[PDB]
Structures are given as structure tokens and as C-alpha cells.
Amino acid sequence: SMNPPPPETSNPNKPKRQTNQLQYLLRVVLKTLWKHQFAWPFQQPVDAVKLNLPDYYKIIKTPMDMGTIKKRLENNYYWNAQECIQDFNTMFTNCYIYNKPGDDIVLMAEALEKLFLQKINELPTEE
Numbered sequence: 001s002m003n004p005p006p007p008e009t010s011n012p013n014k015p016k017r018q019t020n021q022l023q024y025l026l027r028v029v030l031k032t033l034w035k036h037q038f039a040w041p042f043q044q045p046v047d048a049v050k051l052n053l054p055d056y057y058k059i060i061k062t063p064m065d066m067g068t069i070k071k072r073l074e075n076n077y078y079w080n081a082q083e084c085i086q087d088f089n090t091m092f093t094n095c096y097i098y099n100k101p102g103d104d105i106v107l108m109a110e111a112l113e114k115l116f117l118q119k120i121n122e123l124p125t126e127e
């Protein structure tokens with residue numbers, strides 16, 4: 001029933017880059033999903049205590065959220081775009097694992113994920 005530590009957003013010994021793909025992931029992909037009407041549930045780690053979801057972190061062992069992704073991108077935590085893309089996919093997947101088809105939160109995830117997919121479809125070539 002307790003919350004875990006959040007995912008890491010800082011690790012000074014992890015090597016870092018700011019690729020044109022990673023910039024796109026911040027300026028286009030994150031910005032698009034962040035501003036969306038359905039962004040709010042996904043803008044920070046799931047608070048299992050406040051939300052009374054005592055089994056959340058029994059089920060979800062790789063938590064992820066856009067608050068975490070936003071800090072990662074802004075703090076240049078990644079080496080490549082695929083790390084970040086995986087973070088987004090992990091976020092959507094967790095929601096689908098924990099919840100049921102047609103739940104409100106699932107329809108929100110789905111709307112954000114459709115947009116995610118449309119933006120990632122135009123990820124620029126690595127320059």
C-alpha cells in the first residue's frame with residue numbers, strides 16, 4: 001500500500017547525449033502529450049496512497065509517468081531516443097496492465113498513445 005521511491009531522473013555517472021531525436025522527443029512528443037486534456041493522471045508518479053490503490057505497486061514493477069520523462073529529457077538523462085520511447089511505452093502499458101478495457105483512464109492512455117504514435121512516426125533521422 002506504500003509508494004515506492006520514484007524512478008531515477010538523475011545519475012551523474014550515466015553517459016548522456018542531446019541528439020536531434022531526443023530534442024524532438026521533448027519539443028514535439030512530450031510537449032504535445034503534456035498539454036492534452038487527458039495529460040493530468042500521467043503528469044506525475046501514481047500516488048497509491050492518495051488514490052487508495054494499495055495493490056498498484058504489487059502489479060506495476062516498472063512504474064513510469066510523463067513527470068519522470070519530462071525531468072529525464074530536461075535534465076538530459078538519456079543516451080538515445082529509444083530509451084525515452086521505451087519510457088512512454090512503459091507508461092501506457094502499465095495503465096493497460098493495471099486497469100480494465102474501457103475504463104476512463106484506459107481511454108485517456110489510448111488517446112495519448114495515438115498521438116504519441118503519430119509523432120514518433122515522424123521522428124527525424126539522426127543527424
Ligand SMILES: Cc1ccc(CN(C)c2cc(C)nc3ncnn23)cc1
Nearest residue numbers: 041042046051053095098099104105
Ligand atoms: C480517469 C482517472 C482514473 C484514475 C485516476 C487515478 N490515477 C492518477 C491513475 C493514473 C494512472 C496513470 N494509472 C492509473 N491506474 C489507476 N489509477 N490511475 C485518474 C483519472
